[PDB]
Amino acid sequence: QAAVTSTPRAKLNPRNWPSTLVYQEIPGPTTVLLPRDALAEVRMTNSGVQLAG
Amino acid sequence: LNAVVDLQDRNTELSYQLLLDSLGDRTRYFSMWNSAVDSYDPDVRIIENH
């Protein structure tokens, strides 16, 4: 078992593990759907329109 | 996000009072909405002293 799984090391129980050898959780990129339109609400508000909701 | 943007100057009570008159008769009483129109006696404001 050890051969099959354990990482080959020059030192049992190292005091610190390199970033390469530690399991890193890598989530997928997070997409966001921006609700507002930046310019449109400026144009409407300057007109006199009073937005809500 | 509240969608009821109410101003300080509009009058949504007087508007509703006017709206009903143009929508119906405003003479017959409706108990449910308590819509008995406020009125005065025609011959007590302009008293006609025969």
UniProtKB/TrEMBL annotation, chain A:
Report the domain of life of the source organism.
Viruses
Per the record, the coiled-coil ranges are none
The listed locations are:
Virion
- Residue numbers of Phosphothreonine PTMs: T7
Q: What is this protein called?
A: Hexon-linking protein-N
Species of origin reads: Human adenovirus 26
Q: Which gene encodes it?
A: L4
TrEMBL record, chain B:
Q: Where in the cell is it found?
A: Host nucleus; Virion
Q: Which domain of life is it from?
A: Viruses
Recount the UniProt induction comment for this entry.
Expressed in the late phase of the viral replicative cycle.
Give the stretches traversing the membrane. none
Q: Describe its partners and assembly state.
A: Homotrimer. Interacts with the capsid vertex protein; this interaction binds the peripentonal hexons to the neighboring penton base. Interacts with the hexon-linking protein; this interaction tethers the hexons surrounding the penton to those situated in the central plate of the facet. Interacts with the hexon-interlacing protein; this interaction lashes the hexons together. Interacts with host dyneins DYNC1LI1 and DYNC1I2; this interaction might be involved in intracellular microtubule-dependent transport of incoming viral capsid.
Q: What is the recorded function of this protein according to its Swiss-Prot or TrEMBL entry?
A: Major capsid protein that self-associates to form 240 hexon trimers, each in the shape of a hexagon, building most of the pseudo T=25 capsid. Assembled into trimeric units with the help of the chaperone shutoff protein. Transported by pre-protein VI to the nucleus where it associates with other structural proteins to form an empty capsid. Might be involved, through its interaction with host dyneins, in the intracellular microtubule-dependent transport of incoming viral capsid to the nucleus.
The record's comment on protein family reads: Belongs to the adenoviridae hexon protein family.
Q: What else is known?
A: All late proteins expressed from the major late promoter are produced by alternative splicing and alternative polyadenylation of the same gene giving rise to non-overlapping ORFs. A leader sequence is present in the N-terminus of all these mRNAs and is recognized by the viral shutoff protein to provide expression although conventional translation via ribosome scanning from the cap has been shut off in the host cell.
The protein's name: Hexon protein
Q: Which organism is it from?
A: Human adenovirus 26
> Which lineage is the organism of this entry classified under, starting from the top rank?
Viruses, Varidnaviria, Bamfordvirae, Preplasmiviricota, Polisuviricotina
Give the stretch of the parent protein shown, with its full length.
352 to 401 of 952
